[PDB]
Amino acid sequence: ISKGFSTQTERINILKAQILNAKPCVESERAILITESFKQTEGQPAILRRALALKHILENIPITIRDQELIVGSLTKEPRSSQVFPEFSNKWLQDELDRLNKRTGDAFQISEESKEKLKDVFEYWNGKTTSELATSYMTEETREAVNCDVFTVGNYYYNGVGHVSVDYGKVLRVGFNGIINEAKEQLEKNRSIDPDFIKKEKFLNSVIISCEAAITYVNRYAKKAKEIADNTSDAKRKAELNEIAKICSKVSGEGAKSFYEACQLFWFIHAIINIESNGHSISPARFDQYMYPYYENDKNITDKFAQELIDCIWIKLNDINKVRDEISTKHFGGYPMYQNLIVGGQNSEGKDATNKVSYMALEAAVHVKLPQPSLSVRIWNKTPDEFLLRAAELTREGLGLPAYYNDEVIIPALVSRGLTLEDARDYGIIGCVEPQKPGKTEGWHDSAFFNLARIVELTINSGFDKNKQIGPKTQNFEEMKSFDEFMKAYKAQMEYFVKHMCCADNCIDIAHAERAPLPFLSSMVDNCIGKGKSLQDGGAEYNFSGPQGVGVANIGDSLVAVKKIVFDENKITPSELKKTLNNDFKNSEEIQALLKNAPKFGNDIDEVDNLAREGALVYCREVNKYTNPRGGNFQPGLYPSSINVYFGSLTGATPDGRKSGQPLADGVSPSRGCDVSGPTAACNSVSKLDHFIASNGTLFNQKFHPSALKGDNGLMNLSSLIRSYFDQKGFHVQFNVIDKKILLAAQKNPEKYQDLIVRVAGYSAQFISLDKSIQNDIIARTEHVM
Amino acid sequence: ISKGFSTQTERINILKAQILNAKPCVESERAILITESFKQTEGQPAILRRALALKHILENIPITIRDQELIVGSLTKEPRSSQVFPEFSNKWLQDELDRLNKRTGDAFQISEESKEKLKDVFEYWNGKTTSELATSYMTEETREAVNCDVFTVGNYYYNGVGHVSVDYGKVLRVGFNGIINEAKEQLEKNRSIDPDFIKKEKFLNSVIISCEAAITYVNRYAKKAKEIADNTSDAKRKAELNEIAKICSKVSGEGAKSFYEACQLFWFIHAIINIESNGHSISPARFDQYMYPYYENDKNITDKFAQELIDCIWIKLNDINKVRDEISTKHFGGYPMYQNLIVGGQNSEGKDATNKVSYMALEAAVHVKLPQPSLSVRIWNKTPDEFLLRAAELTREGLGLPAYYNDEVIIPALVSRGLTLEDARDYGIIGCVEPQKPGKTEGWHDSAFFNLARIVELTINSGFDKNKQIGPKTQNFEEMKSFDEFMKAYKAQMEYFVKHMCCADNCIDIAHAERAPLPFLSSMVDNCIGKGKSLQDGGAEYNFSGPQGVGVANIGDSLVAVKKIVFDENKITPSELKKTLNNDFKNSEEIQALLKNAPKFGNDIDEVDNLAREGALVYCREVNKYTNPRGGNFQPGLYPSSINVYFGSLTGATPDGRKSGQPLADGVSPSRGCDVSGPTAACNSVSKLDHFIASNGTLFNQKFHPSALKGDNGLMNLSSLIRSYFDQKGFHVQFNVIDKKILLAAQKNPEKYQDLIVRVAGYSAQFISLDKSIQNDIIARTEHVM
């Protein structure tokens, strides 16, 4: 049953326009301030330096209240802009200062004045960043493996970590004063003559200073609100501002006690986190679970105003941005922050937890129609039908939202990783598809991207690449007589690179703990205050590291091709295939056709599906061998953000028929046009993979022609498709519902399609802000009907 | 049976004249070099920065070979001068640049050029020293306790740690190449995917770089030797310089294989240690045990040359110097380095270990007659009579040498602190009187000086001092009715300050580990290479921290006076005594007389000797409660260097009759002229203290009139005095044998007595280089006869 969606107030349109009409730029205030503070704390421990720096920033950072805002708090003067974080890395910025506004995608403006002020910043931070210490900790062998174009650990290397869902619920209940009082109590409790207390004390004091600075920050908006009110004409806007001033004053240090207060305090928590560090994927998680109580108890609010407040937060979540270097930008195209917000699911007791706020979140997506937040819904055996159908309506809107997650697979997967059953049932998603128990984890849910297809090249070329032996010298492909020998060489190549990728991640882990322990963020994740340790030092109850494998379909299709055509049927000799591949099928399209016609993943053909499964398993098993410095384990992920295009441009021709330089498959999805047996057959193939071991998450994309979702019948079919895929143990699925014509038009006349939103992989983005190479990949994806 | 001493070669007199005619100065080379290197290693981990800095220093530090030297290696161009160590502290130097000349005590010259060059040094190291981080780690309350004249933790706060006896024996056998290969083997052993290996690898690589730098340092001298030889006329000196070149070449990286090579390699090890850090008390320890094998196996050497070589080392040990701030200089007056070298004793099997070299060491002291090294002898039940008598002859020479140590007390004391019986039996002395198992310890043997008399003052004034409550507000003295109430208040004051002294020590401990881990020094102490941890990080097998209590006699005499005169006989009320003390006995000498006539420590009077024991035990028991960041325990020591005088000037009048500002007693010695019952009665009193608990060492001074050691009979009396004191469980004892008239003359005409050496406390010094206040204290010490 289609119910349709309500309409947003005019204010929502005003606010939305602010985001879309904004010209993304790089501001310099924060960079100046943090450098300023660090110059004065040279003789203080890192944790105190971080606390004092946050304090200096929050007391001097410019304060902005955009016109018509109900929820205030902006990190940059210009909307949808980015601050700078010199503490992690900055030389890349110094190199790109003049070509930032010359980008085809993810372009950023920067005044001549800002360029001038950053000079001193670059000068001071030379050798004092986390990225430089990280490099120093790595062995020479690891530094080389890092530059072989097999994997990339740049995410946490060039910028902050993030990828966490803080315990918003706790802070909303006790406010910043509560966090302070808790730290003060621990300080009293653990007082001791034991040397260990020395460092624990500095950590706790750092937490106090941080939350105190947070209280100052909120008060600053409180004062600014009045100054605007006193000089605003119409009593309506004046009245709203006086309310804002009043609300900010209360949630200044106290906990929320009304829905409005809860919304504002929630935003300040989220905002401050993004000022302390620029790691993205700061996910609100189960927003409907911790916000509902405040909605239910507020006896003076109307559902209309409650909805408007929510719509404002949806818009504020879009105001945050982050500038990355040229290369990294290809890994995260479309100004993505990946702030995942999930709705629905079950509670810790195993009962359904759908509530009104669950539905208001879905409604907001339609009211705002912006890339953020990354709206998601949890599905389980007892998911109410109305809820799943309502999510289906949203999907039909063509925003790529929401992403669907299967409780039936994730819960068991999390418990096997060490979470209690209660914590597992209460999971939220971080960034793209990474599950975690909110308020208790330091997951590092995206510590690297690993190119699986690249390993196939190395196996065929015995570790030799370009003009150097970059990987182990495994058995020559030419001398192989069985597929087993190929699989052993494949595993040997896999083992070597996974080892160095993880080792590299651990050096970066150490660097962050050594130069950038986060006092503020740590105060909201369990055990940090109790243990007197930061997140970087293992204070979290649960600790993980999550590296992503990219090219699942390419690996499955390649292995079956080598197995069937070379070793089984002997149509080609190893020596012939190797030459053909190294030559990119030049003067040998007969062999390419033979490869392209081989069985392909995504058609419910077990012979290939099982090799895609096994190929991925070799990767996942290698990752499970590793441990991080925080005492946690590494767990495999299979998602790609937008790196499948970049990775593909660095990979030669592969045994599945793909020509050199072409994009790799996205997530665990079948390759372009290879899934020619319908949506269902494709879901059956994907569900054959091991979605339990890849506990860091797997991503599955599917694109339907609009006609497939028309009418109630269309909604019914989408629900069946989803349920059927999840019953077979699928991890996640999300859908694009657009006509190819609209996308093509967008490429011709961007000006006319500024509000066009499309799903990339785990997140939605403004289509015209994506590089052409990413746009084309999306356009080329298989299009299904039901 | 006196045997007199042989005569040194003319060369020794020439080398000796170099030290005495030198004018101590502060050079700037090292300061410039380490600063330059640190600017280039900003992005490296601390351990690597320290390794690279040592490398840069050793490759560019001026090389110097003084005339007629047989053993080469000089740390400063000008003899007996000091290099600078900005990494620990340096602001104090900036403040004293212009008054280093005007000193009455340890005066240092500094060129106008050096002053200019240090400007950059001061500017760069701001906030980057160990002292600044140490302060930052301390709490508010601890910082205050540190600045109220009760104790001082300045030693390891302003400069390096040191106070260690490296495993010289090992390096002499395997050479620097041996250490390097051992580190390389460990690197291959421990190599694993475990995150912990990351930091261990950096440490081991740091060790390699350091030993490699040490190798090139030795080679630079090899090259310089020739460069000089090619420019010297008389074939005799030319031949020596060519021989020096050969030796430095072999010993360059390999172990010694002749007495000469052993002597030269020994000095290089010692010298380089003093280039990496300026922590003093770098003690050669059992020189006779590890040097004897090389002497015995050398078949081409004569005892005359072997002795000359030893005399050369003796002179070289006097070439090293260290500048300290005005205040610290009062704690360590006389240009002291406290390099303790000990001979005799038993081996790990419990058999006597006296050997030929044991005697050559004693002989060397008479040949050179300089303040260093701090010669000592080990004495036990089976010590050969000839040996003890020969040591007695040396004592008669009046150099203050040698210090005597009782194996019968020390061995048991060390075993109770955790050392195996074998390690304890192989102890050597660090600095003044601090015992340790060489090559396996990080003892921190002089982490602080605690003023015991000051606690008595705070007990009487209820923690109120000057114009503020600095200590606990213990029971008001005026309302005390029994001695028990007094002791309880005394313990309460003691507890409070010992707690903060130790906590402060722990913060400094952490600071050194965080900013100054030593790669080179650590490589020669057991478990460091094996554990992949530096000395500062707990790599040593044995770990301790040793704070010194000062004013034992003053505490004993004060407690018996309060007990007897006030509580037992009621001659005066508490209120009256308190008033009289705060008034420094003004217009109440009748009361002072009464206090001075009360029983005094040092006369074999149990009533007072026991309160001296008990008063000291309160201090010792408090210290035992604490542990350091390296997993070790704190152990009490009772010695004062020269701080008894400084501490005295900061202490008001005390209940024993001592007027405000007067020196406190030295070590465990009776106060000036209170021991009026002969040397034996004094020894009996001191032996009543608990010398086992004060495992960090106790110091006992005694001064005899020259007539007491005249003739063989005099030598036998001294042997019996020593035997009796040790049989009664005394820890240590040393004697000054000098005529009062000579010291007074030296004060009147310094120029005439430049070679006059006298015993301060645990070390001998050049009398004229000592400040007048310290000179007078020594002159005022009780003079005994036998």
UniProtKB/TrEMBL annotation, chains A, B:
One of its GO terms (cellular component) is cytosol. The keyword Lyase applies. It comes from the Bacteria. Residues 10-659 form the PFL domain. The keyword DNA repair does not apply. InterPro entries: Form_AcTrfase_GR_CS, Gly_radical, GRE, PFL2/GDeHydtase_fam, PFL_dom. The modification Glycine radical is found at residue 762. One of its GO terms (molecular function) is lyase activity. Gene3D superfamilies: 3.20.70.20. SUPFAM superfamilies: PFL-like glycyl radical enzymes (SSF51998). Residues 666-786 form the Glycine radical domain. NCBIfam families: PFL2-3. This is Glycerol dehydratase. The lineage of its organism: Bacteria, Bacillati, Bacillota, Clostridia, Eubacteriales. The gene is dhaB1.
